[PDB]
Design a protein around this ligand. Structure first.
Ligand SMILES: *[C@@H]1O[C@H](CO)[C@@H](O[C@@H]2O[C@H](CO)[C@@H](O)[C@H](O)[C@H]2NC(C)=O)[C@H](O)[C@H]1NC(C)=O
Ligand SMILES: *[C@@H]1O[C@H](CO)[C@@H](O[C@@H]2O[C@H](CO)[C@@H](O)[C@H](O)[C@H]2NC(C)=O)[C@H](O)[C@H]1NC(C)=O
Ligand SMILES: *[C@@H]1O[C@H](CO)[C@@H](O)[C@H](O)[C@H]1NC(C)=O
Ligand SMILES: *[C@@H]1O[C@H](CO)[C@@H](O)[C@H](O)[C@H]1NC(C)=O
Ligand SMILES: *[C@@H]1O[C@H](CO)[C@@H](O)[C@H](O)[C@H]1NC(C)=O
Ligand SMILES: *[C@@H]1O[C@H](CO)[C@@H](O)[C@H](O)[C@H]1NC(C)=O
Ligand SMILES: *[C@@H]1O[C@H](CO)[C@@H](O)[C@H](O)[C@H]1NC(C)=O
Ligand SMILES: *[C@@H]1O[C@H](CO)[C@@H](O)[C@H](O)[C@H]1NC(C)=O
Ligand SMILES: *[C@@H]1O[C@H](CO)[C@@H](O)[C@H](O)[C@H]1NC(C)=O
Lengths: 120, 99, 254, 361, 99, 50, 49
């Protein structure tokens, strides 16, 4: 909050603008990275209520209805195992929506094979 | 150590932010690292010089932080492009590519 | 009044291990559950500290060089050790610092004193003998405070002369060990900062005689020297230093 | 946004344009209790003052000195400083103060000055040419003077050589006015050096006894024990104020703290070495210092070809501290929140997006 | 800007100086451009009985701005007691003459 | 004098480290490509053209 | 080996630690690159005589 410091800082020009623009580019790049990785389907698929897959069990990878976060047991374990002008911008996609995208991908690859990735 | 790859990214980002905070405590050759002490102890002709030294030190620290953040952003972008490729080719189809 | 003590028994000074003692708080800053690396005058871990005895006939009151700081350890029962002598030449030519704890209070004086060759106090079995100085000419600073004080008590002190400030750090520890220093961790709290602004290069312990000639009560003390080094201090949830790492001791702690 | 982008047309999107600051409202300076005052009551207003050949020197040290009471007193007829300013005595700090107290004649009050030559200056009390401190003098006709004549106050009249600065001479050697040998025996040209004043109540202004106290400051490498008074103000909590606690300054919101300090600790630091906890010096209580709610001001707009309506996002700022909606990204003003879900047009963050159809979020 | 000062005060006619006529008589800015000219005038601006025509502002409440002139002959309050435009105890005229 | 030498040498060292980081990123990309070729051309037969 | 230079260099903070950390990361990255490229088998196969 020193005004004399800012008056002296104005002599150096637009360095601060370049730093802010570079950080803004990185921040939008992270959201673009998440968008490219997880949002590869525009249809939100769901598994059937009856899990009759010919003996194949997907309970450890399908979302758990008992959990409020709607995550899989494996995803829940993964989330448990990860632990002055500065601001942290939140990600555009929340963890619930990323979990929803993974659930849609799992439902598509279980119920429809590779057909959902190439069309209907 | 199963999830070391994500933990490394989190630790690197937190450590870079902590280093950027700790660079404020360095005087960079000035009499003090606090702007208030310089502005209260000295007249503006010499406080201008001391504040200028603090400004150039902190600006160099911030440029270093932004440069290493850009390099790490390039690395994370490459990893994310690889992850998107694996999402398209391993999950949405069956891949003949070995390993 | 001065009295030469001529009934001493000649014996070389002893030496022992410092273990992990001598740690003090570097500043007045609270820290919670964090590890702080600091560069200051610290006592080296597992160092060779000089051991002096008071037993009957041993009466160890020499004058030692102060160096950059003094760690004073005291395995004390019945309060034989009462104070310290601080100065450069220990005569009326220069200005010296006196720390005394008599039967009522602690007195800290910065004056031009004429020290005796053998200074002591005395308890008659009642304290009725003070023979530590003969004169007091030019006083610049006086400070009267609250009293700081099988071996039952362990007294740790750190004395530092930094920028004309005299830092006294102290810690009281209840021990039940008979002979040597116990092994453990105890961080020394800052007790008092003195605005003295004087040169100090030599020090001397002040003991108390027991009269019923004279008899020396059972006491033992240790002198360690402070060196500039780095410590990694651990601060718990409650903000006390529970453990420390000496960065220059061994490659593992490095 | 047009100013930031340096263009008169703005494409649809979100643009970070400014930085919201919670401006500090008050200044809170808390300094500890003003105790252990310097004993100026026993020097200026003592029972009996000393003579000028044997002026009393009192050492003022290890205390806080209130010069405002001394300066605002109207009893003093002379308050002249030669190395400092009277209004800056309460701000500066000195190692020690020498207080020289004596009584002189009213015409000799000017003789206590640097560069001044007089009988009192040369033989009784001498000041250096680079003297620092203040000379204070006041009339004492009602107390010192006696109807039979107060002869208790002596002064030196003769000496072979002039005084050095801050030098006393209480010797009673018989002066040699001429060149005749005198072995302590008074004669035609040998007189006693100390003469008595003629203080009487019938005397006019100039012969009345004046009590003079001279304060001299030392600025050696010793610590500055003597400092001016500290005016602590009241403490204001739960507001973004500029705090100054025992020389540690900053800006923050001071709230109650659950951290129990040890009695020797004063400030508190986190991992990143920033002061987030502090102890008030007046009342021993622990206060948390939360940083003020700084944030980024972003402008969400469609194209200027389409519409001129905008929305403002204050990032990481609660809506009570600034069509107002609270998001996890921050406070959004100017967008109507709807319960329907659409595709993301303008990204806001934390799953919130904005679109134009008015601006909806 | 023309004036007459003492011999030791010629160092105070400079940017960034702390001094008496710098604060209360004539202040130069930190970004001052130009030249200061000083020459001895004992043959012209001095009298054997004392030339008292040149006056300086001994007392003022605050320091001047750069290129600011104060010609106001108002009394100064040096103490807590108000002066009410009348000289007295701790009430002094701001303008004093060089001898 | 040492302040001038320190700031010049520190700027030179920072420039060198930045160039080394960029070249290390390029070599890491080349090594990832080489590992991909080792997996897909040596340890198997690849249908990818060229 | 100038101690005055190091005392003046300590005023600038942890720049040297940052540069050493970056160089150490590059140095271990090269070994990681060689490990990734060439060590794709855990069995040392041998041709027949
Ligand atoms: C699929 O797998 C899950 C988990 O491996 C099975 O759930 C277990 O069922 C047994 C008996 O019903 C319980 O004792 C376990 O505690 C269950 N495990 C968990 C993690 O809940 C499930 O039975 C399997 N089969 C089907 C058809 O879902
Ligand atoms: C106790 O012993 C010391 C050591 O001899 C005495 O100190 C000396 O006293 C003589 C007396 O004339 C002096 O000439 C010496 O210069 C002293 N030595 C030093 C090193 O200063 C001391 O006087 C003895 N105490 C008494 C009471 O006699
Ligand atoms: C301590 O020093 C003495 C002599 O100064 C020596 O004999 C002794 O071995 C030393 N102790 C250790 C543990 O090195
Ligand atoms: C302890 O020393 C102080 C200071 O000299 C003195 O006032 C007090 O009477 C002493 N007490 C005893 C019991 O001698
Ligand atoms: C110190 O004491 C001696 C003798 O008591 C005296 O002559 C001298 O003036 C004193 N000095 C100071 C600085 O008090
Ligand atoms: C302090 O005392 C020692 C020994 O008397 C001397 O060598 C040193 O120069 C002194 N230092 C100062 C600053 O007087
Ligand atoms: C900290 O203090 C609490 C009491 O508030 C106590 O229960 C706890 O055991 C203490 N922990 C340590 C490590 O001292
Ligand atoms: C005498 O002078 C002292 C100066 O400290 C002052 O505090 C006190 O009030 C004075 N006494 C009277 C009766 O004014
Ligand atoms: C300081 O002054 C305050 C004023 O309310 C008082 O409560 C307190 O007891 C005093 N002493 C200390 C040590 O804080």
């Amino acid at each position: 909050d020193s005004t004399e410091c800012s008056n002296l800082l104005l002599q150096y020009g637009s360095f601060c603008t370049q730093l802010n623009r570079a950080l803004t580019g990185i921040a939008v790049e992270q959201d673009k990275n998440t968008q490219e990785v997880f949002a590869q389907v525009k249809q939100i698929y769901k598994t059937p209520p009856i899990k009759d897959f010919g003996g194949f069990n997907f309970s450890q990878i399908l979302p758990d209805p008992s959990k409020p976060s709607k995550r899989s047991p494996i995803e829940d374990l993964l989330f448990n195992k990860v632990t002055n002008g500065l601001t942290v911008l939140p990600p555009l996609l929340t963890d619930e929506m990323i979990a929803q995208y993974t659930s849609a991908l799992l439902a598509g690859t279980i119920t429809s094979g590779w057909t959902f990735g190439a069309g209907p | 150590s199963a999830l070391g790859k994500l933990q490394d990214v989190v630790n690197q980002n937190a450590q870079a932010l902590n280093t950027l905070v700790k660079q404020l405590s360095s005087n960079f050759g000035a009499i003090s690292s606090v702007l208030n002490d310089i502005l209260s102890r000295l007249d503006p002709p010499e406080a201008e010089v001391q504040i200028d030294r603090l400004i150039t030190g902190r600006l160099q620290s911030l440029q270093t932080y932004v440069t290493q953040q850009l390099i790490r952003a390039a690395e994370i972008r490459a990893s994310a492009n690889l992850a998107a490729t694996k999402m398209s080719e391993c999950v949405l189809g069956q891949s003949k590519r070995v390993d | 009044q001065c009295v030469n003590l001529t009934t001493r028994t000649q014996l070389p000074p002893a030496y022992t291990n410092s273990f992990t003692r001598g740690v003090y708080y570097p500043d007045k800053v609270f820290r919670s559950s964090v590890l702080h690396s600091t560069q200051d005058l610290f006592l080296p871990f597992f160092s060779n500290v000089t051991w002096f005895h008071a037993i009957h006939k041993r009466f160890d009151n020499p004058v030692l060089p102060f160096n950059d700081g003094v760690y004073f350890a005291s395995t004390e029962k019945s309060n034989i050790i009462r104070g310290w002598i601080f100065g450069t030449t220990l005569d009326s030519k220069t200005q010296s610092l006196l720390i005394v704890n008599n039967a009522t209070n602690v007195v800290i004086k910065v004056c031009e004193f004429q020290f005796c060759n053998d200074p002591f106090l005395g308890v008659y079995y009642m304290e009725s003998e003070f023979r530590v100085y003969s004169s007091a000419n030019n006083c610049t600073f006086e400070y009267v405070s609250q009293p700081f004080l099988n071996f039952k008590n362990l007294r740790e002190f750190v004395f530092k002369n930094i920028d004309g400030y005299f830092k006294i750090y102290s810690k009281h520890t209840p021990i039940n060990l008979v002979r040597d220093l116990p092994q453990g961790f105890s961080a020394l709290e800052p007790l008092v900062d003195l605005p003295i602004g004087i040169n100090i290069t030599r020090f001397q312990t002040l003991l108390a005689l027991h009269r019923s000639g004279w008899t020396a009560g059972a006491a033992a003390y240790y002198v360690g020297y402070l060196q500039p080094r780095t410590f990694l201090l651990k601060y718990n949830e409650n903000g006390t230093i529970t453990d420390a790492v000496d960065c220059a001791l061994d490659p593992l702690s490095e | 946004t047009k100013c930031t982008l340096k263009s008169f047309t703005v494409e649809k999107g979100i643009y970070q344009t400014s930085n919201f600051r919670v401006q500090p409202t008050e200044s809170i300076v808390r300094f500890p209790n003003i105790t252990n005052l310097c004993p100026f009551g026993e020097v200026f207003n003592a029972t009996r003052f000393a003579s000028v050949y044997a002026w009393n020197r009192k050492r003022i040290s290890n205390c806080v000195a209130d010069y405002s009471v001394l300066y605002n007193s109207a009893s003093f007829s002379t308050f002249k400083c030669y190395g400092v300013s009277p209004t800056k005595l309460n701000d500066l700090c000195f190692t020690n103060v020498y207080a020289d107290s004596f009584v002189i004649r009213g015409d000799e009050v000017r003789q206590i000055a640097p560069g001044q030559t007089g009988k009192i200056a040369d033989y009784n009390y001498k000041l250096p040419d680079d003297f620092t401190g203040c000379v204070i003098a006041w009339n004492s006709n009602n107390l010192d003077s006696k109807v039979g004549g107060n002869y208790n106050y002596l002064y030196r009249l003769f000496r072979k050589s002039n005084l050095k600065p801050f030098e006393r001479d209480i010797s009673t050697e018989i002066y040699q006015a001429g060149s005749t040998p005198c072995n302590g025996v008074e004669g035609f040209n040998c007189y006693f050096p100390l003469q008595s004043y003629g203080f009487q109540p019938t005397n006019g202004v100039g012969y009345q006894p004046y009590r003079v106290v001279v304060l001299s400051f030392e600025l050696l490498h010793a610590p500055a024990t003597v400092c001016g008074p500290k005016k602590s103000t009241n403490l204001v909590k739960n507001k973004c104020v500029n705090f100054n606690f025992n020389g540690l300054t900053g800006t923050g919101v001071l709230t109650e703290s659950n951290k129990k300090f040890l009695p020797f600790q004063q400030f508190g630091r986190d991992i990143a070495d920033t002061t987030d906890a502090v102890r008030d010096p007046q009342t021993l209580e622990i206060l948390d210092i939360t940083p003020c709610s700084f944030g980024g001001v972003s402008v969400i707009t469609p194209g200027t070809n389409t519409s001129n309506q905008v929305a403002v996002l204050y990032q990481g700022v609660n809506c009570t501290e600034v069509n107002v909606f609270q998001t996890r990204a921050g406070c959004l003003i100017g967008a109507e929140h709807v319960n329907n879900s659409y595709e993301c047009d303008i990204p806001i963050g934390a799953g919130i997006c904005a679109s134009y159809q008015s601006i909806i979020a």
